[PDB]
Amino acid sequence: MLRISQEALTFDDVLLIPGYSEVLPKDVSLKTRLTRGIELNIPLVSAAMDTVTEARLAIAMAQEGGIGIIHKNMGIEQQAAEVRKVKKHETAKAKTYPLASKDEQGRLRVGAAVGTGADTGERVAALVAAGVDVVVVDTAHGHSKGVIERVRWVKQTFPDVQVIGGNIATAEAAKALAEAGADAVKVGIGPGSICTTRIVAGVGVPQISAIANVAAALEGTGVPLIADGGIRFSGDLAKAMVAGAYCVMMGSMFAGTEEAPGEIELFQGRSYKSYRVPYKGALSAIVHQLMGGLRAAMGYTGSADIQQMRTQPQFVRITGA
Amino acid sequence: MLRISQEALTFDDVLLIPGYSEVLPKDVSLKTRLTRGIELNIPLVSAAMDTVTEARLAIAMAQEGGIGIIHKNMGIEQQAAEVRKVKKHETAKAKTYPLASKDEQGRLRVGAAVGTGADTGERVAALVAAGVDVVVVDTAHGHSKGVIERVRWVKQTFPDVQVIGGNIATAEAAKALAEAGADAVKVGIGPGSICTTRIVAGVGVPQISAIANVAAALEGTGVPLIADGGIRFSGDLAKAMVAGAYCVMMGSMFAGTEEAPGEIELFQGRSYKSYRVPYKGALSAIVHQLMGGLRAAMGYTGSADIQQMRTQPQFVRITGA
Amino acid sequence: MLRISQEALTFDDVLLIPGYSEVLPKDVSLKTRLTRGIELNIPLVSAAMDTVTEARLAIAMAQEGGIGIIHKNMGIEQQAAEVRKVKKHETAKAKTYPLASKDEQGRLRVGAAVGTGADTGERVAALVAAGVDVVVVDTAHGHSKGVIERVRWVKQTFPDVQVIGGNIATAEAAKALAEAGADAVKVGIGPGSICTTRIVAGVGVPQISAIANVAAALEGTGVPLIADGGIRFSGDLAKAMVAGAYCVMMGSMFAGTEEAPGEIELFQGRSYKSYRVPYKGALSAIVHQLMGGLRAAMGYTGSADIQQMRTQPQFVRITGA
Amino acid sequence: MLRISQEALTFDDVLLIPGYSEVLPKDVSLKTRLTRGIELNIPLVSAAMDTVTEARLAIAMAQEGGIGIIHKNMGIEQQAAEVRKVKKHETAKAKTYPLASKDEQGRLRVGAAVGTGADTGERVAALVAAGVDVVVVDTAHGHSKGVIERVRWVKQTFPDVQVIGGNIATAEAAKALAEAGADAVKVGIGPGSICTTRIVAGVGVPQISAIANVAAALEGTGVPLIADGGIRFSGDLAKAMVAGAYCVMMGSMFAGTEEAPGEIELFQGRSYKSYRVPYKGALSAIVHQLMGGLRAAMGYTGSADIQQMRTQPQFVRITGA
Amino acid sequence: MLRISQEALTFDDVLLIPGYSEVLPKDVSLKTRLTRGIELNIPLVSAAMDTVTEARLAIAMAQEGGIGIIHKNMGIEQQAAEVRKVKKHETAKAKTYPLASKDEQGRLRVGAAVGTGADTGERVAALVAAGVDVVVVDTAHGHSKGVIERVRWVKQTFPDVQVIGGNIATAEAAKALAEAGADAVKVGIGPGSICTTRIVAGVGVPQISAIANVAAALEGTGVPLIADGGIRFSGDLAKAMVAGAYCVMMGSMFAGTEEAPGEIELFQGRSYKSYRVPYKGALSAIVHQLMGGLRAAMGYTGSADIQQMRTQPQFVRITGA
Amino acid sequence: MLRISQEALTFDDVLLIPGYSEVLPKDVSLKTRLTRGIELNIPLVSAAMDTVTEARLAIAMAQEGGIGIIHKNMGIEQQAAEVRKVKKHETAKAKTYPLASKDEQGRLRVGAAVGTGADTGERVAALVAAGVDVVVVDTAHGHSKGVIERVRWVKQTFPDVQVIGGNIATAEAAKALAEAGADAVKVGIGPGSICTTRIVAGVGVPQISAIANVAAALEGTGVPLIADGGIRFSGDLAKAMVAGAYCVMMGSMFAGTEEAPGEIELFQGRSYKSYRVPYKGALSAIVHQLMGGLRAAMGYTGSADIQQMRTQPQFVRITGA
Numbered sequence A, B, C, D, E, F: 001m002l003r004i005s006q007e008a009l010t011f012d013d014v015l016l017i018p019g020y021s022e023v024l025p026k027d028v029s030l031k032t033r034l035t036r037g038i039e040l041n042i043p044l045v046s047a048a049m050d051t052v053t054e055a056r057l058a059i060a061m062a063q064e065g066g067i068g069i070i071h072k073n074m075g076i077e078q079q080a081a082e083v084r085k086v087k088k089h090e091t092a093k094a095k096t097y098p099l100a101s102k103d104e105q106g107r108l109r110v111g112a113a114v115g116t117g118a119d120t121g122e123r124v125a126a127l128v129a130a131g132v133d134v135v136v137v138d139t140a141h142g143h144s145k146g147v148i149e150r151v152r153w154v155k156q157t158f159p160d161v162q163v164i165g166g167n168i169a170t171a172e173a174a175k176a177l178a179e180a181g182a183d184a185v186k187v188g189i190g191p192g193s194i195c196t197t198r199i200v201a202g203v204g205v206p207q208i209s210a211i212a213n214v215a216a217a218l219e220g221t222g223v224p225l226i227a228d229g230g231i232r233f234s235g236d237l238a239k240a241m242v243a244g245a246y247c248v249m250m251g252s253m254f255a256g257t258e259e260a261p262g263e264i265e266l267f268q269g270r271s272y273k274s275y276r277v278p279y280k281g282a283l284s285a286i287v288h289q290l291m292g293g294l295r296a297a298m299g300y301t302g303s304a305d306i307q308q309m310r311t312q313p314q315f316v317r318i319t320g321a
């Protein structure tokens, strides 16, 4: 008698099935897209969190072949200044980053988040003027009048900038954002078992089904979808891609790295970052783990590139046992 | 080979799906009904428990826009006296409660519980004479000859008073109580995983399915249903409404508040209520949490009012994982 | 591709649904049958375990209106002597046991277990000569040539004695034992999640489905089935009856009672029985709990007697959550 | 919307159903095959792990009626020398091993593992020259060009030696290996809930379904399949056989035995093997437990031999509860 | 600079030193005195606690050769009635208690407690009229005007009854009570590490030193001292005697016995006494343990009787280690 | 060879010895002094902590008969304003506080803390002008040039105000502060086992010996000493007085009371104070516990008033055991 739409699956509900393979993990291609107009060499984005992405980590992310989204928990001038640092960054003498995400002028790519408040227009304008590549209209409920209208306003006001809208979790929301002119959508509403959205509001969609529903809705449109939340280890990342994601956004896993905000401190005979989270060392080692696991899964499933990984492998569904 | 009626779901089995929204949580309407004849400004009732509802908390509940049901674990004269205090309460000078549940004479509304024992008739008469708004025929098994007959006797003897019958958990029981003339039904038999009904008798219906089965049975009759049990946080409350409940009854969550029975004492360097349960401070802060979470869910699902919340949003079913 | 017969349910998978009731728990009838020819006033049997049933507990069990099965972990002469004590027991002056299970000569009823070894024939003969009411051919795998042949031999050699065969867990095994002439069957192979049969051999049938499959197979034959294992509290007992059991056998729950074998000793400032298990006091208090819970379930489901309890109420199936 | 092939079951999801039995556990036959051309008296193989199988344990395994696969984590000359020790081993005076796995010259049988690296050809040649009975092309992903080609190369280069290919987990992979000329396949990709393949790559197939899918694919071909992983106790072993396995490979359960590599040391007042794992005493006691449990399951299901055990008994599927 | 009287030792601070022995534990004498005028066959008293001593346990205590002190947490008439039951108790036919504590008329001996409130005089009179052997003026601080005056009043008003005063913990208090005419003193103020006297008031004397200080003060006076508190096992009891105690009072160790107040109930599958404490079975088994341990210590120290045990053996003092 | 001054004792090292008593706890006198010129009706001071003492709690403290010291973790104007609120507070109509600490104009007494920084002079002046009764020169190391000079400056600049200097822990420091003109001293350097002074600097004096050393040094001078730290329950408070303290300062035990700073919030279904610490309800209940325990100890030791409590009772020293 309940109005139940479907059973929805999370990462722990499924496993990838091995398939005939003739391309080794070291030889697969990880190239993909963030948005209609922005290509990435690896399917990885850093979250717009004040513990994760300011200019320093955004620069590292772009150097690795992904991209960072600078957070908005700061003044407009300050956020614009973080964007400028990335766009103006010049490669260290004696270092080479051949995977680096760059715009046509050869500058490192960067994103920045905005919300829907009364100073949003002013914030977007400052970010665009600072040379931002993509504006992320980033809210708790993207399938809403306010977000959809803000996405339209950005596309109308600044036609030359890429725009991401989110967060969403349904086919209908994906279509609405696409129609509003989003160049990509970000997927994740209550994706984790422990999130506050579930406990406070009783709301959420398990992330594997959320991703797959949004992927089917956007199939053949050219609009990428970004998976945002619920991913705990590299195995989950591979599952997200096979569910249909074009790339994955990481947050707290990147907090506490050298490039992330905060300062290293001694605590309990041990290094932490203080603003405390465990110090994690260089971002590059985490990226290596994540992308090594993805490469392994591509080898197991016989996927030679991301387009094959997203569309060809199958899951088995498993039990609690 | 087993006689299995259906699979029955509890709160943890389901999540609300986000929907297109254009009304913010702060702007939704929470108005609803307790019974055919009694409207509430918020969907919240306090339980007829001796740790929860006497006059002081009943007054606070009505001031918040809900209602309290005074417990029956006391003498008839005493319970009647608690009802009288509520009906005679005059608003503090310099305070305003614009949401307050009031009868046509402008007196705060109140309920009181009775059972089915030999002095029930006398107890009901005293409560009615004290000015009670609703009599709750409140038993462990409402789908029984004794309860159904008592509900009929109250409707026959005191036609001008509202009557709630319970507790029930099935479509057939809802219809039987409606036919007996109940102005609302209360839903919950073994709703919690930890309840004694399940352990001692092996009996129970998971509350999400119990609510939805009773809602379908009463659809189009004008008889409200009250959800009673199994609700641990605000997210569960929202799920109960979407399953079809008109309002929700809270018990132990309200015990230990300032307005609840008992006296504050120091225990282990910390405040408790003694008769011990943790002291919780003012009832209003709990109500704020519960209704804030409900408002959040209404925003997420795009429900502008309770009637939409009860009938329009969908669930996903999830796994243990 | 697996050869899966069915999904099988255990007690924790299901709950009883409340039904229209007009007979109170105190007023329901608990009368039932152990075998074609033996009626019990309560649906309770004590297990043939050396920690549970010798003459003293068998006498108490019969006085309560059930029956005990004397264990076979002793010499033939000794086991026969235990049977004789029960048959010769004379009611204490000034005590009355109006529910007592008695044969036509007015002697307390008793059972005794045998296996299939080389001295089984001699053991059966001694038990029968001692006046046993029912012989329980009691093995780990009753659906076997050895057990079926022993059941036939008992029916052929001693036509005037009742015979129970077990243990079984399938419809086919029930039919085979019935055909061999069993007056009842005992159900339970790997019924518990923790049993050695599951861990060592990978073998078992969850007890709710085992009971229901055996009940359907024996429907209309007049052959009772006894549920043996997996029952942890009174709620499980009620579920076993509704699944189709005629009565339930308890083992370790009865160990450590005053009437059970062993001697009380002080251990860790606390009473135990030593041969150690916690001392549990008088058997009657455990029986009261078990039968009180069954009565409660009968009231909830509106079952006026055991025949209605076995055939009329329904379950809901529930999730892990 | 997800590409889900099937629900896949693990050992804990299923139980064996008892069946009519007239052959006791002590009397069943355990004879089976490792490969097209190699018969075993018990369905047990030791893993090619450096903590498990060198010559000493391989000799014990063959004496018990199974076989060991010598690991490849050593130089080619060294691995060849381990094979030679087994082939040249002469039975101790005054000992008799009537179950022993022997070739036609009466020498104990032995296997050895190889991978796919650049010195594989040389390694295979040395093993064959040392008199190995079976070469195990043993990789993490057997359904790959490299493994399939290596299996073909072994069959072409050394037509008189048996070859096992693995590991696989699907019907398609089984067919590919059979076509490449494998004399058996080894089954197990991410079979355990805790394995690194699942966590790092998100890849795996629950072992009960993996076994059954491979069994169906190879039905009527004469190609055996070996179950490799996920088996924790003897009950799991029996389930693997009924799922379709011809024999089972054990690894870490055999580590720490007297015959396994490593040296006994005192640690925390207790014996360990150091290279540390608990000392387990003689291999024969573990084999006895495993085969005793299998015999018990064969008795319960009424399977007189392995061919009946693999093809006749049924499972029930059970819940988390 | 602190005013420290001495270091005070508790039971855990000391051990008894073995001495030359030629009398076995079974052959030592346990005879002693409760008061100037009352001899006991064992050095054991039951506490005046409402969970420990009413008539039933007092009778058992006297039968064992000790004595019970009936508690005062009841009406005066009720307490007098408990005393009367003991004095009027006639030995069961076919039982013999050759150690029994009896007065000159051959009636079982019994004590009863009083405090210092306004109805104390009336309470004492009722107890004496009921035939009590000893009145225990029993307070938290016996070295006080109120207690000393009450002890004098009892000795003056009822010269033929024995009187115990307590509780005390110093030489000065012992002398004051002796001077007031106490026939014995009871020792124990904050004796346990966990008592409320220490936590609330910061007051207490470790029991081994309290006993020894009181013993020295009363040496040569003929006034016994009773040790009351801090004794956890039989070893402590022996230490208390060697420290100078004439007998030992037990409280909570006796609660939960068959003879103690309360009724047996099933709780968590296990027997308790409810008023809950663990059921302990018959008092006699506890007494046997306590006196067996005392006998063992007497053997080890070569003490042939209580007078030697109290005056001859030595302790070693030990460290925390 | 170490330079060890003495063994130093903490509260857990000692217990109070009971003494002859003829004054009941309810009848003892708790009157004492804070400073040469300020008398208190109870020996209790609240700490100058920002979680403990602002005007609201200072007013409650003075009403109870003690005094509060307003903290200095705020601007000078703000701290002066808190002092003014206390001095200007007028007793609620219909309340009577007969124990209240008042100055000669009948205004509630209050203290305030200062340190030694560059704005200290200005801070002291503002406090004095606001009508403060006592200035507490409150530092981590009072036996220092800076503190001693500041104490002199306050006595010189404002001769009519009382001054407390601290913290100290030795006889020499007490004499130095007395000579500088302190009207009282505050005792406590590393008094707790868990304090940072001990862990970081290795510095501290166990509080019982610190108190007694300071008491002996100030004997006959008329200068009170205040015990500050290490006191966990009322029993410790009594021990501090007997060690020689005139009154005791409490900190964190008072944090979280209604009168203390912070605001009540719901957290984990339970009331806390947020700025989080457990909500403790009204200050008066804590004071009642502390002073009830002190009264109990005075009764036990036979101390009729504080002067007797400080000078007459004795301790026993106890072991870890």
Ligand code: NA
Pocket: A020, A021, A301, A302, A303, A304, A308
């Ligand atoms: Na492919």
Ligand code: NA
Pocket: B020, B021, B301, B302, B303, B304, B308
């Ligand atoms: Na809507």
Ligand code: NA
Pocket: C020, C021, C301, C302, C303, C304, C308
């Ligand atoms: Na019925």
Ligand code: NA
Pocket: D020, D021, D301, D302, D303, D304, D308
């Ligand atoms: Na068969």
Ligand code: NA
Pocket: E020, E021, E301, E302, E303, E304, E308
């Ligand atoms: Na001696």
Ligand code: NA
Pocket: F020, F021, F301, F302, F303, F304, F308
């Ligand atoms: Na005194």
